[PDB]
Amino acid sequence: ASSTNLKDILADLIPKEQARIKTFRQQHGNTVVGQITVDMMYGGMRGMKGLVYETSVLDPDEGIRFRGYSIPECQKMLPKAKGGEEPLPEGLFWLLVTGQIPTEEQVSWLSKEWAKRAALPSHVVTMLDNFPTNLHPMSQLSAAITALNSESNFARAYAEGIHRTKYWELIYEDCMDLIAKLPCVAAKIYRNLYREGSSIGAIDSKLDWSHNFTNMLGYTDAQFTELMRLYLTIHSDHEGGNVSAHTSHLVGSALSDPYLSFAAAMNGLAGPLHGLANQEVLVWLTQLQKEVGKDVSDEKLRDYIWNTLNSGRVVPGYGHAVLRKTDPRYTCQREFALKHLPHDPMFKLVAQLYKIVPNVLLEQGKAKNPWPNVDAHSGVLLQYYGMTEMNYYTVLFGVSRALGVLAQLIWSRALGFPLERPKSMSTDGLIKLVDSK
Amino acid sequence: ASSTNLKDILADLIPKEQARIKTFRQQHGNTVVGQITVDMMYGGMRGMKGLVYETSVLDPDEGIRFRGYSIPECQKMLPKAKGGEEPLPEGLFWLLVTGQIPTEEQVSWLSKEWAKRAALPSHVVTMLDNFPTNLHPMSQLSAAITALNSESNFARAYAEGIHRTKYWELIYEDCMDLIAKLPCVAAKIYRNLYREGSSIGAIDSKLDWSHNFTNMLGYTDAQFTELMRLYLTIHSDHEGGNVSAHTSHLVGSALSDPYLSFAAAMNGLAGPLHGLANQEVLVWLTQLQKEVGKDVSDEKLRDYIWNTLNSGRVVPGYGHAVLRKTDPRYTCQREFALKHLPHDPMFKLVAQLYKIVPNVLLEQGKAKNPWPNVDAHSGVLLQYYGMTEMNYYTVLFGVSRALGVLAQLIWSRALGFPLERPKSMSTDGLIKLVDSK
Ligand SMILES: [Cl-]
Ligand SMILES: [Cl-]
């Protein structure tokens, strides 16, 4: 079929993957991987191996891996814009879908595809323009994505009857269309809330996805576009157990189309326990710089931190239960800042905390692995380029996370994963059960 | 505090329930209730005891129970409208929230409360009126519910900081407000799609929820209002493992407010594997009546069915894996039809299938428990009163299911249930794992 066509490459991979899972399940489907306890059921399935998600896996020693590749390896190998040095999100998506590193010519193809499919129907433009400024940007995003399901071709084809084995084909189309549209929707929200409802302008079919997005947002700094490339790539996926991904997976399994699956996933991302870490850190940093001042000594910063731990408070963005070192997504952003904004005062604070915090967390003993995550670094970077509207920052996370959750959604359907339908129990039934047990 | 105030009654129950779970978990939290196998992970958690959901439990011998009470018992004991004989959904909600059967005076209070809170902001009315007729009614519903989260008082209070132990209080308020609003939203959708965008009119504060809903829909038959009461009560809840309920539970656990949780749940309900059983049956019945005609003999119907099973097809609405008898939600609707529309031709067919199908399924041996479910009866009833717009039927299911999923959501938050966050694995990691295992 095609070297550069993603869909031809996918069609060739899928049957070989079906056959490999079938023979694995034939010898080991009955193999016990864990026990369920009462505490796990009350505890939000904490520590329960419950689903198969193919695109990304956490390595406790190396950080999140994308189809086997660590972040450093991705930065190295994935194609960059011309004149750029940050990896294009297009190439990340290719890798997640195929397991393979795309050539420059495959990535260039994918940029064009996304530009060609980027169109919004008039009812969605009209809806966005009529929303009030007190409707949160993530609610605006989800509702507009729900309203685009009028454009789903899977929804249409399923109603006309199609064979199970062919679902993935139209799923693939709808996912490609949704990704293409996302930056248009997100930029209309940004401009309507924060730039007096000015026009997002036109798509340029020779640019990459991120560049079209930053144009439509109204930004002109070439290095902001480089930041956006990096940012969208590194927030793209993080296993399937997080609420945004699991929500897409669960709604997807009912054969709701990608529009509906993704909007549902954005409603979970909007939750304060999933979507707000970047903002929480930036607010704390802001408070901190006010308290201690602009050229604080290492000693005086260390005191502040100790005073804070010995007050039952925590340092946001620091500490993990599993990963044994600094998140490499934190390190990526560090290096960017060292090249492009090393003299910024809020970055200097973020760098100074990186020097000092980890050791203070050890003196306290408590926190197991006292290293920072991706959210400890992202706000100060956005802020520097003038993207200061913190309520909006979860929208960017969402546009990124689409790449991961939709790449998986194609494979959930290719492999014929069934409806997700665990069994619930009430407190009374558990009590009855452990007494008969 | 109050006899008739639901919130005072709830406040008194919650600490006693907290203490009972804490002491149960203290002696049995480590008690193993199941094993996880490879097949369960590929199989959408099939047969995995994974969450605690308090409001409803399936009895394999008696059907779904609401806080311990079977459906027959509910019909008996729950208050009816004056002059009516079908249970008010208000009393069902009371039972789900409290575990207790409300008095007539408590139900009357709850009717008034819901009328008092029923208001839509102008941006939502404007949004609904501008949607095109090709946007599916469930997409319209979800997007309008997402857009109402501007009215969430939990969202507001959480941002201002509130104590964990007090979440349930504002959750309760938002749930009460959402239930109050649901019929307004749903009736605007109905009228805009199917009655030329005519007005839904005003709420009457002396009527019950269902009566206000059927008024706003444009219906005037007193027996349609009785049907609506029954329908909304019996579709209200069915454990937590179904996609709509589990989706609300999962999004909820991130501390997304009820608006966002419920809209996400409607995106899962809209999936063809969850939300379309009523319609599938009615379409099949329609085809059947055309094939065999209006006064078909028992013999000729039996032949048709056999010809259909011996052709690798199935009879929709019949057969269960667990419940060992006819769904009592099917039986409820049967009796209604016997009193109010026993001479309707499509009901006669539905009754004739009930006489004949179960035995033909046994001759085939195959289907384990050859009895009908709630979805085998609901369409012909809607159809009879002139509610013929099949795309809309999932909206009614949604308005009903709110009662169940929101009653639980209050208790998820009262009891401090954490984030839901199972662990995912890729095919490669499972392979690696069973080889080290
Ligand atoms: Cl995440
Ligand atoms: Cl259900």
B272 contact partners, CB below 8 Å, separation of at least 6: A158, A254, A255, A256
Tokens of B345: 């031709």
Nearest to A136 by CA among A147, A146, A144, A124: A144
Same domain, A216 and A306: no
| From A274, A303, A340, A344, active-site residue | A274
Residues of B in contact with A431 (CB under 8 A): 24
The CA-atom distances, in angstroms, between B177 and each of A416, B147, B163, B257 are 39, 14, 22, 12
CB contact under 8 A, A34 and B29: no
How close is the nearest chain B Cα to the Cα of A4, in Å? Answer: 26
Ligand 2 centroid vs B57 CA: distance in angstroms? 12
Strand pairing category for A49-52 and B423-425 = parallel
Cα dist. A271→A276, B155, B235, B280 in Å? 8, 9, 28, 35
Please give the structure tokens belonging to residue B117.
Answer: 């809170």
A10 plus A99 within the same structural domain = yes
Cα dihedral A278/A282/A285/A286 (nearest 10): -170
H or E, element range at A51: strand A49-52
Closest-CA residue of chain A to B24: A431
**B372 C-alpha to center of ligand 1: Å?**
43
State the ligand closest to the CA atom of B278: 2
Phi and psi of A49, rounded to 5°? -75, 100
Same domain, yes or no, for A83 and A122? Answer: yes
Which residue has 């729900």 as its token pair?
A146
Nearest of A245, A281, A247 to residue A376 by alpha carbon: A281
Q: What one-character DSSP code corresponds to residue A390?
A: G
**H-state helical runs in B1-152:** 6-28, 38-42, 71-77, 89-98, 104-117, 122-130, 137-147
Name residue B164's amino acid: R
Residues B6 and B86 in one domain: yes
Do A207 and A227 reside in the same domain of the chain? yes
Q: Give me the sign of the Cα torsion angle B154, B159, B160, B166.
A: positive
List the CATH number of the domain containing B330: 1.10.230.10
Please answer whether residues B256 and B172 qualify as being in contact, where contact means their C-beta atoms are separated by less than 8 angstroms.
no
Which residues of A belong to the annotated binding site?
329, 401, 421
CA angle at B217 for the pair B216 and B219, rounded to the nearest 5°: 105
Q: Is residue B135 a part of any domain in this protein?
A: yes
Q: Quickly count: other Cβ atoms within 10 Å of residue A62's Cβ.
A: 15
Distance CA A278, CA A317 (A): 8
Q: At A243, give phi and psi (nearest 5°).
A: -70, -35
Ligand 2 centroid distance, CA of B382 (Å)? 19
Residues in A touching B20 (Cβ below 8 Å): 427
B421 is in an annotated binding site: yes
Tokens of A82: 């011309």
Under a CB-based contact definition with an 8 Å cutoff, are residues A36 and B36 in contact?
yes
Strand intervals (E) in B277-401: 318-320, 369-372
How far, in Å, CA of B139 to CA of A143, rounded? 9
**In this structure, are residues B178 and B259 in contact, taking their beta carbons and an 8 Å threshold?**
yes
Phi, psi of B417 (to 5 degrees): -60, 135
The residue among A60, A84, A80, A79 whose CA lies nearest residue A70 is A60
Which residues in chain B are closer than 8 Å to A149, comparing Cβ atoms?
Answer: 135-136, 139
Decide if B179 contacts B406 (C-beta within 8 A).
yes
B29 Cβ contact list (under 8 Å, min separation 6): A37, A38, A39, A42
Is B236 contained in some domain? yes
Same domain, B309 and B233: no
A371 membership: H or E segment, kind and range: strand A369-372
In angstroms, the CA B151 to CA A290 distance is 33
The rounded distance, in Å, linking the Cα atoms of B434 and A345 is 51
The tokens describing A175, both together, are 């996912």
Q: Which residue has the tokens 């259909």?
A: B308
Q: Which ligand is nearest to the CA of B374?
A: 2
Q: Which residues contact A263 (CB under 8 A, 6 or more apart)?
A: A142, A143, A145, A146, B142, B146, B264, B267
CB contact under 8 A, A158 and B421: no
Contact B270 A250 (CB under 8 A): no
Hey, of A23, A28, A251, which one would you mutate to test binding to chain B, going by the most B CBs within 10 A of its CB? Answer: A251
Same domain, B285 and B260: no
**Chain A residues within an 8 Å CB radius of B139:** 146-147, 149-150, 260
Q: Is A155 exposed, middle or buried (0-12, 13-18, 19+ CB in 10 A)?
A: buried
Cα pseudo-dihedral B43, B46, B50, B55, rounded to 10: 140
- Please indicate, yes or no, if residue A98 is contained in any of the structural domains: yes
Spatial distance between the Cα atoms of A300 and A285, rounded to a whole number of angstroms: 15
Q: How far is A165 from chain B (nearest CA, A)?
A: 16
Together in a domain, B377 and B329: yes
Burial of B133 per CB tally in 10 Å (0-12, 13-18, 19+): exposed
Q: Say how many domains are in chain A.
A: 2
**Cα distance from N-terminal residue to C-terminal residue, chain B:** 58
Report the C-alpha gap between B389 and B375 in whole angstroms: 16
Quote the CA–CA distance of B131 and B139 in Å, as a whole number.
10
Residue B56 lies in a domain: yes
Which residue blocks in A256-377 are alpha helix, DSSP H?
258-269, 277-292, 298-309, 328-340, 345-363
Look-up: residue for tokens 């890729």? Answer: B426
How far apart are alpha carbons B261 and B402 in whole angstroms? 10
Give the Cα separation of A183 and B424 in Å (integer).
29
Comparing alpha-carbon positions, the chain A residue that sits nearest to B147 is A139
B151 is written with which tokens?
């009215």
Helix (H) or strand (E) holding B349: helix B345-363
Alpha helical stretches, state H, A85-152: 89-98, 104-117, 122-130, 137-147
Residue A436 lies in a domain: no
Residue in chain A lying closest to B251 (CA): A268
Alpha carbon B51 to its chain centroid, in Å, reads: 18
> Alpha-carbon distance B383 to B213, whole Å?
17
**In a shared domain, residues A14 and A33:** yes
**A-B contacts at Cβ under 8 angstroms:** 366
- The whole-angstrom distance between A108's CA and the closest CA on chain B is 29
For chain A, helix (H) and strand (E) counts, in that order, are 20, 7
**Cα–Cα dist B93/B66, whole Å:** 10
Within 8 A by CB and 6+ apart from A190, the residues are A137, A217, A218, A389, A392, A395
Question: Looking at beta carbons, which pairs linking A151-155 to residues 24 or more positions away fall under 8 Å?
Answer: A151/A121, A151/A177, A151/A259, A152/A257, A152/A258, A152/A259, A153/A177, A154/A257, A154/A258, A155/A257
Ligand nearest the Cα of residue B240 is 2
Angle at B262 between CA B260 and CA B266, to 5 degrees: 115
First to last CA, chain A: 58
Tell me the sheet residues that pair with B372. B318
Task: Please name the residue of chain B whose CA is at the shortest distance from the CA of residue A415.
Answer: B42
Task: State whether B251 and A260 contact (CB < 8 Å).
Answer: no
* Element housing B378 (H / E): helix B378-384
Distance CA A210, CA A230 (A): 9
Let me know if residue A435 belongs to a domain.
no
From residue A353, how far is each of A139, A340, A376, B95, B275 by CA, in Å?
A: 34, 19, 10, 53, 51
A427 CB neighbours in chain B (<8 A) are: 17, 20-21, 24, 52, 54
CB within 8 Å: B422 and A246:
yes
Of A391, A411, A431, the domain-final residue = A391
Query: Which residues lie below 8 Å from residue A427, measured CB to CB, with a gap of 6+?
Result: B17, B20, B21, B24, B52, B54
d(CA A255, CA A419): 8
- Give the burial class of A2: count Cβ atoms within 10 A of its Cβ; 0-12 exposed, 13-18 middle, 19 or more buried: exposed
Same domain, B227 and B326: no
Q: Which of A235, A238, A320, A377 is catalytic?
A: A320
Judge whether B257 and B152 are in contact, CB under 8 Å.
yes
Name, in order, each residue with C-beta under 8 angstroms of B357's C-beta and a sequence gap of 6 or more.
Answer: B305, B315, B318, B370, B372
Tell me the one-letter amino acid at B280. Answer: E
All residues with CB under 5 Å from ion ligand 1: A 238, 242
Taking the CA of residue A257 and the nearest CA in chain B, the distance in Å comes to: 8
Are the C-beta atoms of residues A80 and A88 closer than 8 Å to each other? Answer: yes
- From A264, which residue of chain B is nearest by alpha-carbon distance? B264
CA of B410 to the centre of ligand 2 (A): 19
User: Domain check: are A206 and A219 in the same one?
Assistant: yes
In angstroms, the CA B250 to CA A425 distance is 16
Solved using: X-ray
CB contact under 8 A, B260 and A143: no
Question: For residue A64, what are the β-bridge partners?
Answer: A58
**Can you read off the two tokens belonging to residue B33?**
């209730």
- Determine the 3-state secondary structure of A32 from DSSP: strand
- State the nearest Cα–Cα gap between A74 and chain B, in angstroms: 19
Active site residue A435: no
Distance CA B230, CA B245 (A): 20
Q: Which residue has the tokens 């966050």?
A: B421
| Three-state secondary structure call for residue A318 | strand
* CATH code of A55's domain: 1.10.580.10
Q: In the structure encoding, which two tokens stand for residue A119, read together?
A: 């169109």
Using DSSP, state whether A50 is helix, strand or coil.
strand
Using DSSP bridges, classify how beta strands A56-59 and A63-66 pair: parallel, antiparallel or unpaired: antiparallel
Residues B405 and B385 in one domain: no
Could you give phi then psi for residue A281, rounded to 5 degrees?
-65, -45
Q: What is the CA(A242)–ligand 1 centre distance, in A? A: 6
CA distance B227 to B210: 9
* B46 residue type, one letter: R
- Residue B176, domain member (yes or no): yes
**A343 within some domain:** yes
Phi/psi for A136 (5° steps) reads: -55, 145
Q: What residue numbers bound the domain in which B264 lies?
A: 1-276+392-423
